[PDB]
Every structure is written in C-alpha cells, then in structure tokens.
Write an enzyme that holds these catalytic residues in place. Sequence first.
Site, short mmCIF file in Angstrom:
data_model
loop_
_atom_site.label_atom_id
_atom_site.label_comp_id
_atom_site.label_asym_id
_atom_site.label_seq_id
_atom_site.Cartn_x
_atom_site.Cartn_y
_atom_site.Cartn_z
N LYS A 35 -5.88 2.96 7.36
CA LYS A 35 -4.66 3.76 7.15
C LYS A 35 -4.98 5.25 6.99
CE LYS A 35 -2.45 -0.13 4.86
NZ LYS A 35 -2.25 -0.69 3.51
N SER A 60 3.09 -4.89 0.76
CA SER A 60 4.07 -5.57 -0.09
C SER A 60 4.67 -4.55 -1.04
CB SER A 60 3.41 -6.68 -0.90
OG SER A 60 2.74 -7.57 -0.04
#
Lengths: 203, 203, 203, 203, 203, 203
Positions: free
Chosen positions: A134, A91
């Site tokens: 990640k 986000s």
Amino acid sequence: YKLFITEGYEVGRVNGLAVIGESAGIVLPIIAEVTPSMEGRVIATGRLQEIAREAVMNVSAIIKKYTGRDISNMDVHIQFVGTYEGVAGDSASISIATAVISAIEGIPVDQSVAMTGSLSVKGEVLPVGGVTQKIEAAIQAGLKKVIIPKDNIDDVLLDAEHEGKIEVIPVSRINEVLEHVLEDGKKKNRLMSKFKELELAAV
Amino acid sequence: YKLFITEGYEVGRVNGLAVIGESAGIVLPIIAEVTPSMEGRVIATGRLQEIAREAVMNVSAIIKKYTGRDISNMDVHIQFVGTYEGVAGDSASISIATAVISAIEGIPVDQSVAMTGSLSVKGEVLPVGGVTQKIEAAIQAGLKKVIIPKDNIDDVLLDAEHEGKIEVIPVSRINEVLEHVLEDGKKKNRLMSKFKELELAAV
Amino acid sequence: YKLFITEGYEVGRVNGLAVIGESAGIVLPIIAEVTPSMEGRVIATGRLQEIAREAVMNVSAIIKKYTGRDISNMDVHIQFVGTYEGVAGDSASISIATAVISAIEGIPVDQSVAMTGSLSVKGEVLPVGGVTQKIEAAIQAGLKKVIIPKDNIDDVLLDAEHEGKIEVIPVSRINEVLEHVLEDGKKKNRLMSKFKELELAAV
Amino acid sequence: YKLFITEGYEVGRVNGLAVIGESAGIVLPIIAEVTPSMEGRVIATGRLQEIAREAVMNVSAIIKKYTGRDISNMDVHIQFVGTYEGVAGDSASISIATAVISAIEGIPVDQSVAMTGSLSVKGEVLPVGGVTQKIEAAIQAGLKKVIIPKDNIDDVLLDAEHEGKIEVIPVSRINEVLEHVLEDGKKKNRLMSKFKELELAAV
Amino acid sequence: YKLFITEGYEVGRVNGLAVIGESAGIVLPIIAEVTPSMEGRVIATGRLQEIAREAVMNVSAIIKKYTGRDISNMDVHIQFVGTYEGVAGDSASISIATAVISAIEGIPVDQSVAMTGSLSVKGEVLPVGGVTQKIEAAIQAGLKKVIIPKDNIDDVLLDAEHEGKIEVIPVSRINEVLEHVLEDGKKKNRLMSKFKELELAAV
Amino acid sequence: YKLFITEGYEVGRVNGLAVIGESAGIVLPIIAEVTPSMEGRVIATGRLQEIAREAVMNVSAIIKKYTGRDISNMDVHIQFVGTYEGVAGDSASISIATAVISAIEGIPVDQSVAMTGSLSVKGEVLPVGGVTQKIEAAIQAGLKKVIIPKDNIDDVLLDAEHEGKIEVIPVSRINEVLEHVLEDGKKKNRLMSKFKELELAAV
Ligand SMILES: [Ca+2]
Ligand SMILES: [Ca+2]
Ligand SMILES: [Ca+2]
Ligand SMILES: [Ca+2]
Ligand SMILES: [Ca+2]
Ligand SMILES: [Ca+2]
Ligand SMILES: [Ca+2]
Ligand SMILES: [Ca+2]
Ligand SMILES: [Ca+2]
Ligand SMILES: [Ca+2]
Ligand SMILES: [Ca+2]
Ligand SMILES: [Ca+2]
C-alpha cells in the site's frame, strides 16, 4: 487521468489504500456524504459495501459517544472511487471512518496523506495486511505521507529508492489520524477537544 | 433506425456516452422514471445495473441534502437504451444522475447535449476513461455539444475534421451539467437555486 | 399445429414478434400471469429471461405511477411460447409489457394483432430492428394487424403481394397499443382513463 | 427391466412422453419431490433441466394463485427417469407440472395414463410436436390412456392395429388433466374445487 | 501482524474462539462499545450478526435484572476482528457477552484468557462444539488460559505437547467468567457483588 | 455434548420439540427470563422470533387474567437452544409459554418431560403437526415423558421398540401441563390454585 487528488484539502474525501489481487497496492479514494434520513441507512454498493458498513457502524459509535452528533438519524453515503475486480479492502477501513467524520463536521482532509488501518469501535487503529505494498502505491501516486497502524511498523520493507519518498506516520488511535489529516482551524480544534476523552479512555 | 434523439427536450432522458470493447465509443441513452414505493428500490437490470445503483445512490445524496425530495421513498427505474455486450460505463454515470433529477423534477433535458463523467456523492464530476472516443461517438450521432469532466480536458485529441463538429463543455460540478442541459424556465430556476448551496459548499 | 392463436381475445397473451438468426421473423407469443408474492419476483427462464426482466421492470414503473397496482408485491411470470435457438427479442418488449397489463387487469388481448417495439420506463414505444421481417412473419401467420414503433415506419419494405395483407399501425406510446389490442368494455375504459395522464405527460 | 410403471397410483410420478431423435417416441417418466428450502430452488440436472425449470415455474404460478401453497419457499426436485441422448421434451411439460402438483398435495397419479402437452402460466394445455409418435410409444409400453392437447387432435394418425389400443383424451386445461389422472378421494375433491376458478377464469 | 492481543487488560475486548470450516479453530477477538441511543439497537454487520444479536440480547437480560444498567436505552456495537469466510461462531457467544459487560462497566478484560461457550438468558454457560480445536487455536496464539463450558470438559483431547501449554478453566456461569478475566479492583468487586444473586438463583 | 438436560428441575427452561425439514423431530430447549422494563418488550431473535412473540403474547393474556402479574411492564427474553436451519416450530409453542410462567414464578420445570402443542389465548392446548416424529426425538434424547395435545393422540404411531420408551401425556389445557412439569411445593400449589379458574372457565 487520475481518480485521486494528491494535494489540497477536500471535505469528505480521503486517499485510502487497498490491495488488488494478493499483493498489488492501490490508492482507493473514498468520498462520503451525510444527509438527513427524511432511522438512517448506510448507503453503499458494490464489492466493498460490507467494509463500508463496518467502517460506518464503528465510527458511528465514537461519533455518538464523544461528539454527540445524531448520526443514527442521518443517511451515510460511501463512494469508492475507481471500480476494481478483486479489491481487498481494510476491515472497518479508517479511510472510510475519516471521510465520514470530515463530511459530518465539514472539516477538509489533506489529500497528500494516504492511510490504511482498521477502526475499532473503541477508536483504536488496528493492524492490516499488505502495508508495504500500500505504501508503494502511495509513493507511485505522488502522495507525501502515509498513516499506518503502529502495529504494522515492522511490516514496512521498501527499496532504498522508495524509502525516503514518503513519510510513514504510525498511529494508535483515530484522533492521531485526525490530527495529521484535518485542516488546521477553529473547527478542528473544537472537534479534537471532543475526541480528547477517547484518548484519555484508551490510554 | 436510431436509439437516441438528437434534438429537442425530453423528461428523464439523457444521451450518455460509454465505451464498447476497449476503445469504441457509443451513445448510450438513459431513461429514468421515479415512482412511489407502494423503502424505495433502484430498479435496473442487465450488465450495467451496478453503475445504475452507484449513480442513483450518489444522486440521492445530493437530492436529499439540497432539494429535500424524499427520494428514499421512491422507486427509481433506470433503463439503458440499446443492449450491447462488453459495454464499459462510467462509474456513477452523470448521465444516469441527470436523468433521475430530470424525472423527479419534471424538467426536460436537451437531447443535443451528450455527457460523460462520474458523479461524486458531494456533487463533483470526476474524470472517466475514453473521453476522445466518446466524443467521437457523439459527433457521429450528430449531437451538438458534449459535457466532459474538466480533468479530462487534456485527454481530448480529435482529427481536424472532427474538431469543430461538437462543442466540448468541461464541468466541475453537477449544477453546471444541469445549467447546460435543462430546459430554461421557472422550474429550472427554482431547482438551480436549491443547487447553489452545493456549489457554495464545493468551492 | 401452431403455437399462436390468430383470432379472438385472450387474457395475458400477446402475439409478439422477434427475429431468429439475423433476419428471419417469427411470431413469438408471450403469456403472462401475476400472482401474490406469498417482495415480488420476475419469474422467467431461458435465453430471453433478460428481456422479460427489462419489460416487466419498465412496465412496473408505469403501472405503479399511473394505475396504482402494487405490482411490487406480485410475482410476474413470463412465458415465451416456442423455444428457439438464436432468438433476438425486442429490448423491453412491448408484447411482454402488454401481456403483464392484460394479466393484472383481467382485460383480454386481441390475438389478431401482433406487435413489436421496446417500452421505455416513461411509456414511450422505442424503435427496434428487423421490422419488415417481423411484419412478414405476422403475414405468414395470418394475423390481421401489426403494431410497430412510429420511428420504424420508414423501415417497412414489403412485396406488392404482402403489402395489403396486414394493417401496419405505428405507435408512439403504450396507451395507443392498449387502445388497439384490448377488448372494448368497462374495464378497458377505466384503464385507458388512468393511462391518459401518461399521454398528457408525454406530449 | 422397465423404467415406467404401467398400472397403479403413485405420488409424484407421471408417465410423460417425449421424442428421441426427430421422430421416435419414448415414455419419459418424471418423478418430483418438494421439500422445505432450509427462497426455493428448482433442482434438476441434465439435458432437460431447462424444460424442468419452465414447467416448475409455470405450475408455480397456478399453484400460488389458485391453491395458495407457498411453493416459493419450497425446493422442487425434478427427476427424469431414463437418460437418453437427443431427447426433445415438451416445453413446460404438463407431465412435470402434474408431478409437482401430485407431490405437493400428496395425491397419487394413475400410472396407466401417459400425457404430453405444454403448460401455460394461465393453466392452459398448449400443443406440442410428435403427438402420433408419442402415442405410439405409450401403446408399446402397454399404457391404457394418453392425454394430449386438444389442438393436436388432428395430428393423430395411427395404424388400424394401434388405433383402438389406447384411449386418447384431448384436454384444454390443467384441471382436466388432474381430473383424469389423480386418484379419486377427499384430497382430490378439495384440490379440484380450488382449481375450478382457473377453469372459470379460462372459459 | 496479529489481530489479537495476548497479554494485558483492555476494556471491551475479549479473545473469543470460533471455528472456520468444519474443524479449524481460530481466535476471534470481539470488541464492544455501548453508547447512548440519541430505544437502543444492537449494531453489528457481516456473517456473524445473528450471533451478536443473540449474545447482546441474552446479556441484556442479566444486565437489567442484576446490575440495573438501562441497556435498553443504549446502542451496543459489536465488532468481530478479522473477517473470515465460513466462520461458525458460538450461539450467544460468551465472548460477546463479556465484551459488552466490560464496555458498560469500564472494567478491562485480561487478553491472556480466551473463552468459548454460549450464554443463557439465565446467566449459565452452555456447551458448544469444537472445543479441542478452539483450545488448539488459543495455544497457537500464545494465550495463557482458556475458559470453556463445564459440560465440554470431556470433549478436550490435546497432544501431550499441547497439553500443558494452556490452563483450561471450566465454568458453569457468567460470574465465574468475569471472576477469571476482569481486572481486580474496586469496580470488579462492586460488579461481582451484584452478580452474586445470579449465582444464588442458579445454584 | 448436548444442548438439553434430561433430568432434574430448572427455572425457565423447557424441553420443547420441533421439526427440522419436513419430518425430522428435534428437541428444542427454550430458556426464558423476565426482567423489569427499565412498556415491556418480547426480546427474541432468529428464525423463530415470530413463534416466540406468539407464545409470549398468548401466555401474557392468561398471566394477566388469572395470576395478576404485571407482565406488560416486564421484558420477556426467549432463547432457543441450538440454531438450526429449517426449523418448523409450534405456533404459540406451549414450551415457550411454560418457560415464561416458570421464569416469572421462580418454579423449576422437570427436564425429563418434553412437550409440544400450541397455546390458545384462552389457555387451551391446540394440536400441532409432526407429533410422532417429535416423540421419536424425545425418545432418542432419553427423556421420560412427553406432553402432547389431546387432539393429537390418534397421530401417534411408534415402532414396538420405541413404544414403551416414553410416557405420552395428552393435555387439554395449560394447567395440566404445569401440573406435570412444575416442581411440587408451596409455590406450585399457590400458582395452580390461581389457574383453577382457567380450568373452570374452559370446561
Ligand atoms: Ca522523513
Ligand atoms: Ca515517520
Ligand atoms: Ca465552438
Ligand atoms: Ca468548449
Ligand atoms: Ca389498410
Ligand atoms: Ca396503417
Ligand atoms: Ca375408446
Ligand atoms: Ca377419446
Ligand atoms: Ca495447569
Ligand atoms: Ca484447569
Ligand atoms: Ca406407561
Ligand atoms: Ca399416557
């Protein structure tokens, strides 16, 4: 071939990180360009366009407040390099915010530094999911460093073999991100001086 | 019959290359037209409409920045010649970007030159998959030259018989694409001079 | 009974040609209507709705550019007369494009003239498959003339008995289509004069 | 019991006719309702949903053009009374179109009048198959009149015993359908006056 | 990780409460920033942008009337922390209104206090749905207090185990909200004195 | 909980009535606030913003003409209490007009009196749809009286059980509305005296 660059400095390009499916990390490079509006629009398409709008609107707040660029009268183009089904992005992705700042200021970004995190409208870097995964993707891409939100530091759990392959840099605020990735120079100095008030306000 | 033209110069038409299934190359001509908006829309339909939106939005950034055409107040129509199931196109296809520039400027494109690559919002040509297979399709169509992203040069592996049948032209940036495919003349000279700043900015 | 009219002039109706299965030609009449949008939609349903969208979007480009009708604020309804399983239609069918122009302009179309071809966004008529088989269907329906793309002229192979039963009219561009099928009169003259620039631009 | 009403006036209900198998006629009543959309949808289910979409989209064109009802912002619910396997309905069935007009206008339809035919987007009533067999079904249901497309008049072949049991009314256009089935009154007068332009345009 | 802070004082950030699906409560932090307009815009994106516009427009009325800040010439950026599908937010959410006041005044908000309610343009706090479920979410997040509209007091029904875990604070008006959440100090005193007239007017 | 108050006097708040879907009545409270413009704007958002603009512009005409308040240099904030999909409001709703007058004058409105009607720029109350259904909603909310346009009196058709539960007050003009809902007192007397000329002009 590869869709990310692993070394060198490029204007408007950032090695972001995202997740595909539930857990697989990917390097998701962002390229941004700002143009005159010829009211400015966020120009983005595809599955991640909402994240692009969030990041651009949030960074616009800090750009207006602290740098005085009239970003409201610019079009801001956001490109995600590599289309994937089922990408879950950050986000208000800090990689998108950083790419926009780099594009507007003409200051190149270090491609060896990946990042993940969400930009608050106040300039804070907020925690995100999937940080270990990640980081793993960044390691597999041959990147040297990875910026993560400080609040995700305890979310890192890498194999002994992967630990040690990448420098993890926790951050609280956007100016630390810019400190680590922007090319050193007059332009950077000048921009960092404007962002100092953000840090003063946030601490 | 054939859906591509192999020789001559045409406004708004480019011999792009794509893949069907996993590996089969095809010539995928693009035809573009720009009109007054009577806010402009990207008008495209079918399985490849997202790629058309990507390419048109990315090229719009460079058109606004470097040429000053008010593309934001134009409708941009993208047509893919030949419907195929299972086409995988180039993200932000340079063939679509080129067709749009040709259409807006009224400068014809050399039909003997096929191309593949992805346009960055900064004007760079980014690598794509399936380059050997696309080159093969260009050879089978009787095209003389094929533009490819420089970063895909080491992806080329053709038979001795196919090698030698087509000139492979690697490129870094959109202006090199335009140099090779746009018809020589006053109009081209004028446009290439505007795009020079893109090259200066990108090098 | 029959679903096509073979003689006379009708607004918004065109005797298109298509293929069912792999090779059987059919007369596929199209009826179009344009209304106020009360942003305009292409309103079509069934197996051929994508072809209707292609044709309407492509013709909209030429209508906006050359005639200045605000087709963007109209709904465009496309009806295929006769539902068939396994119809293969012409991409961007010129019969649909022609029906839309006829509907918007209120100029009737000659029902004795069938047509097949694909409309480019630039106003060109592009080649299609199955031309011999479509011509055969036109002959079996008792139609007098059939418009085909010029590039399909060498695709015509009819029996001695069928040769001679229909006038084959090859075309390069949409205005030649309109020349042959639109009812002569003030309205046609006026419209053809607007489309002259398309021809000038395309030659 | 019976699924059709044979006498009286009902809003939004029409005695359509269809075929089951290859040749057996059936009375297929349609009930329609229009509601606010809370973009409007055609809401229909089952084997005949495509026919419902065709009829509703085609009638929407004439409603928008000639009556100015904002049908685009209404949901249109189509119900087929009596589920049958192997029903072959009329493309763009005029019974569905009529039911929608009746529902939107609040003008009841004469249940003693059955109908078959296909509505063009221009308001014409186009020929259909199985007319004799549909007429037979209407006779067996005790209906007084049957509207058919004028172009099907020569398709009628009834026994001496069946001839004479029903009034066959051939029609060219939707307004003739409405003339024969809508309840006489202020509302009808007003609606018929709006549809007069359709007739003027179509003749 | 967590997207809310549970203790401490932060400028422009409020722990709002919302519902996902029909009944599940969530903590929905809001972060606001105000900038110069460089006419001001409400800048927000996503599923809850309408609620952000409502809250910002309503609070702008009270800010203009009682505090005299020229909020009409500011951009107001609203960020919802945590994207969820199917979030039902409070109309004119008091958490958004409070975040805006905090941002404009530079007075930090107590993160240990969650709130739910709708702001009237007159400064009243109006009742909302799902209060028990929102309180439950606040308890599960480890928050100390929850502000609710006074008219929802009889809507609270918690287990014995949950009762006692959070202080429920009913309110009538925005100034009571600010009394409970704003950091004590000169700035607060000054602001509360301006809002006193709202209370005088509303009682 | 409830979004309307059923008894007492409140400044700037009116129990309006509207319809959801085609026929269901709802109580739709309006809250208005007027502020200095810091040219004034109508500030409203959501599906009913056009109705708010209509009502505020129309009431502004009568306020300027008859009361001399410089409403042109005020911002006027309109809030609809309770968001609903598919609300159909009264054009130029008298409830909005009344709320604005109450807000500007500081004279409270009787919450036990609901109203529906459209305000003309001349101060007349014009007829609206759905009056019976709105009255029903008022009865279900426990309101004592309902103001309706005089021209809708013959549109009232309530069950014996509902008849008798609410006083229906037909009106011709805005001053009758204000007579019935504004709190008695010096302020009201003074305002009603200014509006007397409207009545003199309108009769
Ligand atoms: Ca290290
Ligand atoms: Ca470290
Ligand atoms: Ca060579
Ligand atoms: Ca070469
Ligand atoms: Ca001949
Ligand atoms: Ca010929
Ligand atoms: Ca008779
Ligand atoms: Ca008869
Ligand atoms: Ca306690
Ligand atoms: Ca308490
Ligand atoms: Ca009474
Ligand atoms: Ca009465």
